[PDB]
Amino acid sequence: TLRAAVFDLDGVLALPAVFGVLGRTEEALALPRGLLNDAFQKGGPEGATTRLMKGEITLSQWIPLMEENCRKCSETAKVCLPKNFSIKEIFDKAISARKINRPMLQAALMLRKKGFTTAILTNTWLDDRAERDGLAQLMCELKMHFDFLIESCQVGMVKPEPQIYKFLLDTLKASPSEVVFLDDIGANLKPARDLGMVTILVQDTDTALKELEKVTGIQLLNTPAPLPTSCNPSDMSHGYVTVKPRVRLHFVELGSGPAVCLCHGFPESWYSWRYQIPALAQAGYRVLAMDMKGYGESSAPPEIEEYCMEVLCKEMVTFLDKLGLSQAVFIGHDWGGMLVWYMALFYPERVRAVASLNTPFIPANPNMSPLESIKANPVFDYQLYFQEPGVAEAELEQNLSRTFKSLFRASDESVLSMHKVCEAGGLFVNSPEEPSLSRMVTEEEIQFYVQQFKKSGFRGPLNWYRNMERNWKWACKSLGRKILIPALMVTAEKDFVLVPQMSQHMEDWIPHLKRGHIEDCGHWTQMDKPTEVNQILIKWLDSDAR
Amino acid sequence: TLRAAVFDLDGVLALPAVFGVLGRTEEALALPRGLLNDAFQKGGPEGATTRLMKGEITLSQWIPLMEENCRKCSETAKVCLPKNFSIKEIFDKAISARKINRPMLQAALMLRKKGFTTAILTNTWLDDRAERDGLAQLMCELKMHFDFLIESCQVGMVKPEPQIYKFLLDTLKASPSEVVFLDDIGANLKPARDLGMVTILVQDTDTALKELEKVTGIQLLNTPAPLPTSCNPSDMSHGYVTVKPRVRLHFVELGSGPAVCLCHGFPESWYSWRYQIPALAQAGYRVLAMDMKGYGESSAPPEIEEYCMEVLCKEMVTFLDKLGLSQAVFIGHDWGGMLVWYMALFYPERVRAVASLNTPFIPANPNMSPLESIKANPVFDYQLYFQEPGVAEAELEQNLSRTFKSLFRASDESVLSMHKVCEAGGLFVNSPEEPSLSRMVTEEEIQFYVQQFKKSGFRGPLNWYRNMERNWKWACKSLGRKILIPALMVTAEKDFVLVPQMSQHMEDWIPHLKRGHIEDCGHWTQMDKPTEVNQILIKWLDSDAR
Ligand SMILES: CS(=O)(=O)N1CCC(NC(=O)N[C@]23C[C@H]4C[C@H](C[C@H](C4)C2)C3)CC1
Ligand SMILES: CS(=O)(=O)N1CCC(NC(=O)N[C@]23C[C@H]4C[C@H](C[C@H](C4)C2)C3)CC1
């Protein structure tokens, strides 16, 4: 029967509670016990704190009224307050020490995932201090995980007034016996109980979660490590920049701080970075995730030569110019990773830092044609199949659902043999017509790619392979250079095409290269090991690109 | 006959030249004259500097080769180099001291405006130093004003090789006698002259501009103060955020740094901030210029109550949440300025700083209905005309060209009487059917607004006036508050509706309010006095919001 869960911010979603810091201050300053808590509630509903929680006055307006209540309290207590005493300093440190109670948020997320409506109901103030950004940042991180956020100062009502609980029930569109309410202050539970709601008194997190487990029948404690937050296409800010008359690039944008540009591979989308976008934004970066030329909502001209590296790199520079960005950190994967090494070799001033996932930097061989180096590697046989225009397109567009289900699989779930693709006459000749769904992706995630490739097709994406000779001549101009800006190479142990050993001589060209290695990871790195990728990127960004 | 003008970067568009700093270093370190310039050119076409300018090696790779050339030069000169000597320190300071030669750029802009094709042809390097952002920032500011930017290190050719001048002519699609070429190095002029191009040797800027004046027949020196750079709609990054199921907000974005949100008035567009967008981005800010709800590419629902202040403010907060911005500086004008005061009163944690142009903060009167305060002011008579749905829409949509030409006029060019609008039965009853074009706007600029209002109409925009009672009740909740975050009020001397005297008691509610005043400025502040507005905003942002 339970279908909604309500949490308080202070003392349940964020720790430690403000009241906890008032008691710690009394002890530290050798003040009479309870003195600061008495001044805090001085007057009850008529008092300064009630006016503050109702939104009648701001936090900066309340500070001198609280200072006064401390003096009036100390005169009756026959005590002398120190000359260092400042309500502002006490509150600045208390508000700043508060951090998200990770196990409580994890439990809220699990309940929402299992069908629950979740909400935060808190007694809070209008913060106009010079340090108010810390609070804004906290609320933003939390509000994306809950259906509703009800703040006292916005609705003009406070807990424990009975009107605020009636307002909650009408917002949730639920009966009181369908709601669980968690709060660390007993007085605030009193009216929730009178109405018939299930209440949990939060003293410690573990005991509170055990009570929540019993009452919901869902496992919350000792649960496996959850996947990172993935973003929703319809909730993203969508950007469109025209880089040249017939070419418009589409990107998705989130966050503030140094710009980080994400470049997907074949046959993918901006959506392939869904697990990295919210994490990098939360770490302090402005993320721009591209739909590369030939894909999704970006232009897809039919001409082969529109997809040679030289053209693709020039358009990326124009993209930064039109956005008004002098520099960006470039992070690529697969074909995108190849592009970012060439952005660092040809436009170092525009690249703050460079990172590639799976794709190594391979210098061009001036003594051997690229088509003969391709024939030397039997794993790269499929690249010869991709050369004839129309051939690979017809097979890949014949059944879009089959194409993405056959490709997006973990390394143990493989269903294709990359050698003798030309002999066999196709990539899916020895493959099932209806392949099983991989453990990496959901049906809905596969359907997103199917929708994007129904508009564009495979001509644009396949043309990235039809410029071997043009790319070879252009890359031969950089054989005397070294990459001397911050660089990161991330290898994937189980990528059977882009094997880790292909990157072993990279230190000859990038002397101060930083490395990362991911075990049991296949070709589709971002969605195969999302937490590992996020950890490696954030650690490197904070040190080499700040 | 002249139709193209080519400029060099070092020593002509940017001062001082690198070579000038080499001579100053020799003098400062008591080194033999010419020693540093000899090491710089050691080897000629075989030398390290030629390989650097051709893109064969990067700047960081050239530094130790130049250091070596300095030692080989000092051994023959029988001199001892100091133990402080560092080519890296010398070049870091030289590159950093270089600033745009404002009169030269102004002259280039004037020529382009008069039909010329303009270009930069420079011998430059691939800069991979830790300080390379200074150079990237410089090139970005310059490249937006020129048709082509040809850099030696990108084309593999250097000046004075004859092949680079032939490459220039084919890019410009022009005959040599149709081109003017400016350079500070005589040797680089030599091949331009052999081909038949008009050449100007730059020793000092003033003499160079006088030569350029004689040869083009256009006045460049002693010319009036130009208007700030205005942006082109088709070159902007266009953003779309869905804030609620039926409502999508459109914005234009440029720059990097702290976020600045621009909010236009009635009946305007994001385009009303065209002169402020490039200036604020150049000052170090990330500018987001909104199409407010009811206008342009933003949603325009027909319901009146979708345009009350409470709804408009909540959507602005959702806009920041979806973009991943904890805070933004809010700058409004007219109806937008009213909105930003309410964003600071109701959501201070999300507002880094607040500024209003023309619109004062007016607290609600709890003893008087807003419709009776409106009747007390005869200038606000037109607000009663706007109340009946359909009435003002039909008159304003009857002739879109007439509407924007009648409204967008300077204070001396006024063509409407705001009193007895209801008696007369319309805003344009005593107005000409074909009004003259104002000095503030071009025909093309008027046509941009006509195109935007052809899609949307005037229902949405007029609905912002049809919530007097709802806005009054909501604002009565803030009568106990004070605005205690950084605030700026900018008054316009000749605004006959929003008169400066309407803001005189603002210090009672915003004690530390900063003020700005613009003389001879009417209602349309941004486009009436663009340079003054930019100056006032940038000075305030750099001090109160950094
Ligand atoms: C030029 S490169 O060596 O940097 N190059 C190699 C091939 C790579 N991409 C690639 O071919 N990946 C796929 C990904 C799956 C699996 C297999 C076949 C098909 C679908 C293409 C390899 C891009 C970069
Ligand atoms: C509620 S307020 O006092 O902040 N309010 C007053 C009116 C103002 N805007 C306004 O009415 N401006 C116009 C601009 C031109 C000139 C005249 C008539 C018409 C076209 C509207 C005033 C918006 C803010």
Structural account:
Chains A, B: It comes from Homo sapiens (Human). Two copies of one chain form a homodimer. Chain A is of the alpha/beta class and 546 residues long. Chain A folds into three domains: 1-16 and 97-217, HAD superfamily/HAD-like (Rossmann fold), CATH 3.40.50; 17-96, DNA polymerase, domain 1 (Orthogonal Bundle); 236-545, 3-Layer(aba) Sandwich (Rossmann fold), CATH 3.40.50. Chain A has helices at 18-28, 35-41, 48-54, 59-76, 87-97, 102-113, 133-143, 152-155, 162-172, 186-195, 205-216, 277-283, 309-323, 335-346, 370-376, 382-385, 391-398, 400-407, 421-424, 443-456, 459-463, 468-475, 525-528, 530-544, and strands at residues 4-7, 14-15, 99-100, 117-122, 148-151, 179-183, 198-201, 237-244, 247-254, 259-263, 286-291, 328-333, 351-357, 487-492, 514-518. An eight-stranded mixed β-sheet of chain A has the order 8-9-11-10-12-13-14-15, with helices on both faces. In chain A, helix 2 packs across helix 4 (59-76). The interface between A and B is large, with 56 and 56 residues. One 1-(1-adamantyl)-3-(1-methylsulfonylpiperidin-4-yl)urea (XQ9) binds next to helix 14 of chain B. The site of one 1-(1-adamantyl)-3-(1-methylsulfonylpiperidin-4-yl)urea (XQ9) has 10 residues of chain A, from helix 14.
